[PDB]
């Protein structure tokens, strides 16, 4: 089953030099600090909070609408500060997501209506099924589904996730073409 | 006039939507896109109650009946101190005690009363109404699973650090003196 | 995986058992030109690793420690990794606020190694019984 | 690295 | 020699682990989560077509061997604890799954009652297993299970769950919380098995002998005037979050009385032991009476053993048993393991006996040559 068409009106999007397609309605905060590596899709009502720490995001990742990327807060012994958030290449974040993960690897897929606890670490090629909460300090190993409330390991992904996911994200970018201005 | 006068030291951002005759304490922080709508009556918020992101606090008149009870029916919402309102929280409780944190994506019922030290877990709903006992943690989406806790825990250092970093990036609402 | 509905397209796998499964879930042996399924193939254990702290564990250590990590603890109220917190240390869960103080385990001075499991009361009689039945079996 | 603010400024310049 | 694994399949729970261990490593519900179906399917099902049972057992044993036991299946022997008079087709299907697919070296189809006997160190007792599906009494005398004097009744956990569901649906009082704070009986058509099991294990208990008899008499209430004992307080069990089922006090002690109710047939959990004992050889009675072993999950309910022993001593005085079993001293054993896994502990003790376990068990070469698993039915 190929990725279906998903058209957008060209007026409320910004296409950048690197190829990032960031929606106008997305709430970018501290945009001087945010870094997108190109070919990124940030949909409407996305609250990317770069005003607290470095929020770097990899290539071809998709951040669906109404999703918040907020870097976590860590209380270390020497004092207090905000940990920078890092997201790898080819990450598919579904809508209505809440992300407080310290690190999200590459080839990751977060299900819709998901909340990720503070300072979580998501290794590469992991899935989180829909309507799932990951409490803080939860480490998802590669090739595992973390589902339920709380998210518990309840399966393993197929072998070819590194290939399937990079196909899916590329198809999503290639099929996210602007509406016909007729 | 929906008086938005706030005590000094508040770091509410202009992006954070606040409507109605609100009242917020000195040290309270409010993040961008926080919604504080006060249509039924004024909202009183004490010091230190930090509001995060998609926090929709509506003092909405009860549409379940809407009998025009006591004409206006002000019912001011009083919120305690050293509280936390995480991302996606949907709070409607009229009274809230000090040292109250509600995790992300939580529903609080209109008729609920939140006492001191209580914690609401993420992806939980409190449509049912009753007074919450002290230091009660409500966890789980399948059910509520109320569990007694030994003590509360505030987040003052995070609030202080937010006070440092926020006004440099975002323009806080330049509220005049109350 | 689930973004494109792989279950829509089902390849059939030849063999003793006729199984229809998505192409992503099939394996193609190169020596046997017929592709092989997950049910047809034989599984073997290659290594043990703790999911919380991604530390590979040798099989002998896995047998000795009963397939359990040396450091991490799973919360009893909800199966979530308990986190050590310092006041002089105690385990506290992240989702529910289950602390070590609830069941009454004294705070350990050391960070990680202090915590240990109780000994089974009937292990001595188990050893006596197994020794007796071993000599009878002999 | 090219910060997202720089890309937004360049997009504004293009318009 | 590598340590042999031990498996005890049951309708309610499956106990898995390694031999020579103080207790089972794994104990889980005997279900497999197939994709697309909300409520999972029971692994151990009798009277179903062999292909479906084969697939279910394949998936479940794979889960056991690669999720709970972290070890290959081919390397280590197996000690499968199956109850006596287990359905034949299920047994050969299980052995076929173990041999053809997993290629284990050999599986020992040990009986549960004898294994439960091994844990105590004695060599003769009347083993009663109060399983999920049914309660079963078997006497063992010097390592010889006396199949001729077997007994069984369908008063396990399944009947108890059904009785609990019936009583709850009758005296249902649930606060839905959505404009239904008052009692709203039977808002849900049927309670799931998990909720019934949790209510049974957490709230319900077995009352004393005198209280139980008074409850049974007051159930009829023929010319009775408040003869029932005062019940325990009601318990408000939360369902699904908002819902709050007000489990009545009377249910908590009356639901389990179906096990000990006679009902004009002289058949109950307690009477089962006496019925089996009265059929035994004349010499075997005393050693079987003084050695009683109780196993099974239902026996773990609070106050079950006291009620059982009191009911045994009470029914002994009745005219049917007075002549034969009248002057007898019944005594219950206390095996080292919890009654859930006494049979597993016996199988684990048998597993470490490496020398005999090779000869007693059925080699895969023999199974391939013949394909016929040994059984106590005629060959
Ligand atoms: N710790 C416990 N306390 C009380 N009841 C329990 C406990 N564990 C299990 N049960 C109940 O005991 C019954 C299960 O008994 P058990 O685990 O011995 O059966 P099984 O081995 O699954 O089944 P069977 O022997 O019929 O194949 C169910 O009613 C379960 O609710
Ligand atoms: Mg049993
Ligand atoms: Zn670990
Ligand atoms: Zn917990």
Swiss-Prot record, chain A:
Keywords: Acetylation, Centromere, Chromosome, Cytoplasm, Cytoskeleton, Kinetochore. It is found in: Cytoplasm, Cytoskeleton; Chromosome, Centromere, Kinetochore. Transmembrane segments: none annotated. One of its GO terms (biological process) is ventricular septum development. The modification N-acetylmethionine is found at residue 1. InterPro entries: DCTN5 (IPR047125), Trimer_LpxA-like_sf (IPR011004). PANTHER family: DYNACTIN SUBUNIT 5. Subunit of dynactin, a multiprotein complex part of a tripartite complex with dynein and a adapter, such as BICDL1, BICD2 or HOOK3. The dynactin complex is built around ACTR1A/ACTB filament and consists of an actin-related filament composed of a shoulder domain, a pointed end and a barbed end. Its length is defined by its flexible shoulder domain. The soulder is composed of 2 DCTN1 subunits, 4 DCTN2 and 2 DCTN3. The 4 DCNT2 (via N-terminus) bind the ACTR1A filament and act as molecular rulers to determine the length. The pointed end is important for binding dynein-dynactin cargo adapters. Part of the dynactin complex that activates the molecular motor dynein for ultra-processive transport along microtubules. This is Dynactin subunit 5. It comes from Sus scrofa.
From Swiss-Prot, chain B:
GO terms for biological process: mitotic spindle organization. One of its GO terms (molecular function) is dynein complex binding. GO terms for cellular component: centrosome; cytoplasm; dynactin complex; kinetochore. InterPro entries: DCTN6 (IPR027777), Trimer_LpxA-like_sf (IPR011004). Keywords: Centromere, Chromosome, Cytoplasm, Cytoskeleton, Kinetochore, Phosphoprotein. The keyword Magnesium does not apply. It is found in: Cytoplasm, Cytoskeleton; Chromosome, Centromere, Kinetochore. It comes from the Eukaryota. CDD domains: LbH_Dynactin_6. Part of the dynactin complex that activates the molecular motor dynein for ultra-processive transport along microtubules. PANTHER family: DYNACTIN 6, DYNACTIN SUBUNIT 6. Subunit of dynactin, a multiprotein complex part of a tripartite complex with dynein and a adapter, such as BICDL1, BICD2 or HOOK3. The dynactin complex is built around ACTR1A/ACTB filament and consists of an actin-related filament composed of a shoulder domain, a pointed end and a barbed end. Its length is defined by its flexible shoulder domain. The soulder is composed of 2 DCTN1 subunits, 4 DCTN2 and 2 DCTN3. The 4 DCNT2 (via N-terminus) bind the ACTR1A filament and act as molecular rulers to determine the length. The pointed end is important for binding dynein-dynactin cargo adapters. Belongs to the dynactin subunits 5/6 family. Dynactin subunit 6 subfamily. This is Dynactin subunit 6. It comes from Sus scrofa. The gene is DCTN6.
Curated annotation (Swiss-Prot), chain C:
It is found in: Cytoplasm, Cytoskeleton; Cytoplasm, Cytoskeleton, Microtubule organizing center, Centrosome; Cytoplasm, Cytoskeleton, Stress fiber; Cytoplasm, Cell cortex. Coiled coil: none annotated. It comes from the Eukaryota. The modification N-acetylalanine is found at residue 1. Subunit of dynactin, a multiprotein complex part of a tripartite complex with dynein and a adapter, such as BICDL1, BICD2 or HOOK3. The dynactin complex is built around ACTR1A/ACTB filament and consists of an actin-related filament composed of a shoulder domain, a pointed end and a barbed end. Its length is defined by its flexible shoulder domain. The soulder is composed of 2 DCTN1 subunits, 4 DCTN2 and 2 DCTN3. The 4 DCNT2 (via N-terminus) bind the ACTR1A filament and act as molecular rulers to determine the length. The pointed end is important for binding dynein-dynactin cargo adapters. Belongs to the dynactin subunit 4 family. Part of the dynactin complex that activates the molecular motor dynein for ultra-processive transport along microtubules. Together with dynein is involved in spindle assembly and cytokinesis. This is Dynactin subunit 4. The chain holds residues 2 to 156 of 467 of the full protein.
Curated annotation (Swiss-Prot), chain D:
Belongs to the BICDR family. It comes from Mus musculus (Mouse). Highly expressed during early embryonic development. Predominantly expressed in kidney, undifferentiated neural tissue and developing eye. This is BICD family-like cargo adapter 1. Part of a tripartite complex with dynein and dynactin, acts an adapter linking the dynein motor complex and dynactin. Interacts with KIF1C. Interacts with RAB6A and RAB6B; interaction is specific to Rab6. Acts as an adapter protein linking the dynein motor complex to various cargos and converts dynein from a non-processive to a highly processive motor in the presence of dynactin. Facilitates the interaction between dynein and dynactin and activates dynein processivity (the ability to move along a microtubule for a long distance without falling off the track). Predominantly recruits 2 dyneins, which increases both the force and speed of the microtubule motor. Component of secretory vesicle machinery in developing neurons that acts as a regulator of neurite outgrowth. It is found in: Cytoplasm, Cytoskeleton; Cytoplasm, Cytoskeleton, Microtubule organizing center, Centrosome.
